[PDB]
Structure formats: C-alpha cells, structure tokens
Amino acid sequence: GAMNSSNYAELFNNDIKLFVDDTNVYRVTVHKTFEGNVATKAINGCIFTLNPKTGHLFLKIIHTSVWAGQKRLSQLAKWKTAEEVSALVRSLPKEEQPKQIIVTRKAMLDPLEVHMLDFPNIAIRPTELRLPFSAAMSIDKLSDVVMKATEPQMVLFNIYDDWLDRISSYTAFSRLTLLLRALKTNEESAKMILLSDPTITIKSYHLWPSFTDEQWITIESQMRDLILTEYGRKYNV
Amino acid sequence: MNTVPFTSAPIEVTIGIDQYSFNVKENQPFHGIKDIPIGHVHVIHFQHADNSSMRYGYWFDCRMGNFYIQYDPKDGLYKMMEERDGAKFENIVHNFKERQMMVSYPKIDEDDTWYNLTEFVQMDKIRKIVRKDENQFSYVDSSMTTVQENELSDPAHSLNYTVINFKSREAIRPGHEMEDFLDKSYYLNTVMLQGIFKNSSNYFGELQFAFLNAMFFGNYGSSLQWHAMIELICSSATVPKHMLDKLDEILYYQIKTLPEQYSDILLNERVWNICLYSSFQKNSLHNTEKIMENKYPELL
C-alpha cells in the first residue's frame, strides 16, 4: 500500500525502486492576449524518476512539441508520464527493472497501473510523504538541460554526486529532501547559502558544491534555519 | 398456465415466486403454485423462518419439463426436482388443484413488471452461468461467489458471470492505454458485444440475471456484476442508440422494483453518480435518472 513515515527504511533496502514525480511535466506561463483574454504558453518540462538508494536520476525532458494540437493537457500529462516511465522500465535489463514504483501524486496511480499491465509483479504505490521533488527545476544544471532541449531527450544524473562514498543512502536522501525543501520554500536564500563561499565550487560532473563533511553540517543547519525562518513568516508563529 | 406442486411444507418458510412472496406455516397444507405464466423464466425462492440466512432458490422454465418442490430433511432445504412421468405429474397437480391447496401466481393483467425484468433472460444462458447440467433448472443462493470473486473457492458452486475488469489487458489495447481507459467503447463493442456475448440481447440477459440474483438472494457478487455491466455501457462514448434506449428501460424497471429499504446495500453510490452525472451517457438515461432522483435522491 502507501509509503509513509512508518515504512521509511524500505526506501534504502536492496529491492530496486523508483520515485516518479510528474509536477514539472506540463509547465506553462499564463499571459494576456491582445484582445485582453488569457492564454497559456507551454515551456519544456521533465519527468523526475529517482532511485532513492543509488541516486540515479532518469530525467526525461518533455519538449513543448508533445502538447501540439492536444486537448486537456493536464490530464494528458499524467498519461504521457505513465507512457515514458513504462518505456523506461522496458528499456532496462530485467535485473535493473524496479520491483516498486512510488508516485508522489495519487492522480498518477491509474495512468501508471494501466501502462504497466505487462508488469503485474511491479507494485505501483502512492506515498503519504510530502516530497519536495517539484523543486528539481531549482537545480541549475537540471533547469539548463530542460530549457535548452529542442527535442525529447533522456538525461541521466546522480542526484547525490559522490555523497555515497562518505554517507549512507538514508543520510543522502535526507540531505537531498532538506536541500529541495529549502529551494522550494525560498529559492533565492537557498541558492545564496549554497554559493555564498566562492572557494567551494561545483565539479563539472556534479550538481551540488564540493562541501567537506564539516561544511555540509553548516550548510544543513543554514537550510533548516531558512525553512523555520520562512515558516515563522507564512503562519505568524 | 403451468404448475409447480409441492410434496409438503414441513418447515415454516417465506416462499417467493418472481416478485411475489407468501408466508407458509410449519406443516401448513400448502401444495404449490399454479397459473404460472408460460413464456418467461421464473424463480421460486425460500427464506426459512428459523434461519433467515441463506436465501436460496431455483430458476426454471415450465416449457422445459415438469418441476416440483420437495423438502429434504437431511440437507434441510426445499429442493426442485423434475417428474419424468407426465401422467403421474398431471394426476398430482389435478388432485391438489381440486382440493385448492395451491396459491395462484397473482399477476395483474395490466402489469408487465416480470416481462420487463426478464425481457432478455433465457434459461439456456442461465444454465451456462450456473453449471449443473444434470438438471434443467438452476440453484442460486445468498453465498455463491462469482468466478471473478474466486480469482481475487469451490469452482462447481460458482456464478460464471463474464469477467469485466477495467484495468486488464482485455480492456486495454497496447498503445491505446489512455484512449481505452477513458472511453471504454472498444472494450464494450469489440471485446464484449462482437467477441463474447455475440449481441446486445445476451449482454442485457446477463445484466438482468445479475440484478435479479442481487435483489432476490442479496448475492453480493451478482450486485458487483450488475454495476460493472452498467458502468461499461455508461463509460463508452460510442454505443448504438437502440442499446441506450433499451438500457434506460431495463434500469427503470429494476429501480422501480427494488425494495425502498434495500437501496443502501443494493445500489453503489459511485457507479450511479458517475453513470447519471459524469459519464458519456449522463444525458441518455432520462427515465432511469428521473426515477432515481424521485425515489433515491439521498444516494445521489
């Protein structure tokens, strides 16, 4: 059934699993027309498919051409996500196929279940966790490859950089969710925290800066402070 | 007009014949039901006064043989049996009629209710859903599970309704996932009507049989089958006009006949709200929508 606080360790066991987040698949700008009506313009999106154990990220870029001449795009976006996840599973060798796919939004369950009928032993699950994967487009290198795409494209990343050389998957996922939560709550302040010291750079082959273990503790503190400072604003508390 | 004689009534029981019912007392001199209209299937059903659990009963057609009921004190139920000796049977019925020990099938001449509930129901189709080929009549009860229920456990005592499953390879063509899930027309028209049922008459016959088993025995699996066959039609954008017009009539008579007090257990809120208010056919079931709104506005 549903993935929650109670069964959290299951994310880091040796059963292959993927999270699928569809919140950046169908992206629009809303604008006024010459006649004073409102219209949307689509921009490039992405499917965020992540192995939480290994950090392997399958970023399927969704080019605006896939919407051309289609109706009910917010509905189509769920089916296109399920089609592309199904195509990704079929493209993997049998020993690499996931045993579970966890969707971050319950509206993905039926579309993915119907696309995966050929895989009855792959469990399609919702989650009670509120995961911040919508903030994936606040990671500069992911945003850059999505916006520059001129055609549909799959790009592979490790969202943990080299962290698993020094820390467990559990700790790496906790760092990632705290960084994305901060970027989601106050993007400008989060990015300021990450780049304030110019001597710490992002390797060409990495997404995040090259922090020592001690510098990661300071960064993680600064991110928790940002989230609480922001919460002290939203709610007047 | 045919007759189903009863050897006796040793235990106190409520006896149904189609939509009608009669209380019989322990050892009351009851010897059966006469004036049963030829041309339709019928059901004769039982609920014991001392254990109102297991409603059970027999689907039959008097054109297919001479049937009687006899209580079996070992198996503790009223059993249907066929009498193969025509002259013996005629002589039994004549005596019981002469002694007026029979209730008369109480049909009002104006009243087409039973025809309207059984229009497409044929004994030969019942005998394929309920498999017991040594008898020309069919036993159904409260507890019998469906082939679909058994997949999700004695297969000889199962209701072999046609399996309908909206998230199955049968329902969904590879490469038409979204189209087939949101518009079930290919599942209805190609797989089920052309493929399995051969025509709308057989599909409606199964729908009507499923409703009657749900209503007369509170058979839960039958109720699931009735709702699935309605939902498959209402969820298809492309349905022949004659099927929609006929479905509205079928459902109107089913909703009209349902006991008011059983709406809560026999009607699925999600299916009916979807079928009348959101589905492709939300505007195609005028008679059904009007009787549902006036009789069961709470459910909606």
Long-range contact pairs involving A25-31 (C-beta distance under 8 Å, separation at least 24): A25/A62, A25/A77, A25/A80, A25/A81, A26/A62, A26/A67, A26/A73, A26/A74, A26/A76, A26/A77
> Which CATH code of 3.30.420.230, 3.40.190.10, 1.10.260.40, 2.30.130.10 fits the domain covering A9-163?
3.30.420.230
Does residue B18 contact residue B106 with C-beta atoms inside 8 Å?
Answer: no
CA dist., res. A78 & res. A112, Å (int): 8
A-chain residue closest to B167, CA distance? A114
Nearest CA in chain A to B179: A79
Query: B75 forms bridges with which residues in the sheet?
Result: none
Strands (E) across chain B are located at 2-5, 13-17, 20-24, 32-36, 42-48, 56-60, 66-72, 77-83, 103-104, 138-141
Shortest CA gap A116–chain B (Å): 10
Cβ(A53)–Cβ(A162) below 8 Å:
no
Residues B114 and B214 in one domain: no
Residues B194, B91, single domain; the answer is: no
Q: Where are the beta strands (DSSP E) in B121-215?
A: 138-141
Cα separation of B208 and A77, whole Å? 39
Go through chain B and list every residue after which a break occurs, taking a C to next N gap over 2.5 angstroms, comma-separated.
Answer: 152
Tokens standing for residue B297: 């506005």
Q: What CA–CA distance (Å, rounded) separates B208 from B226?
A: 7
**Residues B136 and B177 both lie in one domain:** no
Resolution limit in angstroms? Answer: 1.5
Residue type, B260: E
Angstrom distance (rounded) from CA B250 to CA B210:
12
How far lies A38's CA from each of A4, A32, A44, A178, B87, in Å? Answer: 40, 5, 20, 36, 86
- Are the beta carbons of A214 and A222 closer than 8 angstroms? no
Number of H helices, E strands in chain B: 12, 10
Going through B18-120 in order, the beta strands assigned E by DSSP cover 20-24, 32-36, 42-48, 56-60, 66-72, 77-83, 103-104
Among B167, B177, B179, pick the best mutation site for testing chain A contact (most A Cβ within 10 A): B177
Verify whether the Cβ–Cβ distance B167 to A117 is below 8 Å. yes
Nearest-Cα residue of chain B relative to residue A76: B178
Whether A82 sits inside 8 A of B177 (CB atoms) is yes
Q: Quote the Cα angle for B292-B296-B298, to 5°.
A: 130
- What CATH number is associated with residue B58? 2.60.34.20
Are the Cβ atoms of A114 and B169 closer than 8 angstroms?
Answer: no
Question: For residue A124, what is the DSSP state?
Answer: E
User: Which amino acid appears at position B27 of this protein?
Assistant: N
Contact criterion met (CB < 8 Å) for A111 and B172: no
Interface list for B 167-206 with A (CB within 8 A): 167-169, 172, 174, 177-178, 181
CA of B173, closest CA in chain A: separation in Å?
10
Residues B109 and B177 occupy one common structural domain: no
Question: Beta strand B56-60 with B138-141: parallel, antiparallel or unpaired?
Answer: antiparallel
Please check whether residue A176 is in contact with residue A221, taking contact to mean a CB–CB distance below 8 angstroms: no
Contact B178 A113 (CB under 8 A): no
**Strand ranges (DSSP E) for A67-126?**
100-103, 123-125
- For residues B286, B288, B293, B297, the Cα torsion angle rounded to the nearest 10 degrees is -150
User: Per the CB < 8 Å rule, is B181 touching A114?
Assistant: yes
Last residue of one domain, picked from the residues B143, B160, B188:
B143
CATH number of residue B205's parent domain: 1.25.40.550
Experimental technique of record = X-ray
Number of folded domains that form chain B: 2
**Residues B254 and B159 placed together within one structural domain of the fold:** yes
Print burial letters for A118-156: b (CB count within 10 Å at least 16), e (below 16). ebeebebbbbebebbbbbbbbbeebeeebeebeeebeee
Note whether B152 and B294 are same-domain residues: yes
**Which of A79, A125, A83 lies closest to A105, judged by CA?**
A125
Domain identity same for B191 and B127: no
Could you say which DSSP state residue A21 is in?
E
- Which residues from A are below 8 Å from B178, CB to CB? 76, 79, 111, 114
Asked which of B143, B168, B196 is the last residue of a domain, the reply is B143
On whether any CB of chain B is under 8 Å from the CB of A76, the answer is: yes
Is the domain of B221 the same as that of B121? no
The CATH code of the domain at A164-237 is: 1.20.80.40
Q: Find the residue in A nearest to B174 (Cα).
A: A115
Query: Which residues of chain A does CATH 3.30.420.230 include?
Result: 9-163
In this structure, are residues A22 and A133 in contact, taking their beta carbons and an 8 Å threshold? Answer: no
Which residues in chain A are classed under CATH 1.20.80.40? 164-237
Looking at the fold, whether B72 and B24 belong to one and the same domain comes out as yes
Whether the Cβ atoms of residue B236 and residue B282 lie closer than 8 Å to each other: no
- Mutation site, B178, B181, B183, B184, interface A, largest A CB count within 10 A: B178
Q: Are residues B80 and B194 in the same domain?
A: no
At residue A113, what are phi and psi to the nearest 5 degrees? -55, -45
Selecting from B167, B174, B178 the residue whose C-beta is nearest the C-beta of A113 gives B167
Burial of B260 (C-beta count, 10 Å sphere; 0-12/13-18/19+): exposed
Q: Which of B143, B163, B189 is the last residue of a domain?
A: B143
Which strand ranges, in their side-by-side order, compose the sheet holding A45-50?
A123-125, A100-103, A17-21, A45-50, A56-62, A153-158
Domain that holds residue B192: 144-300
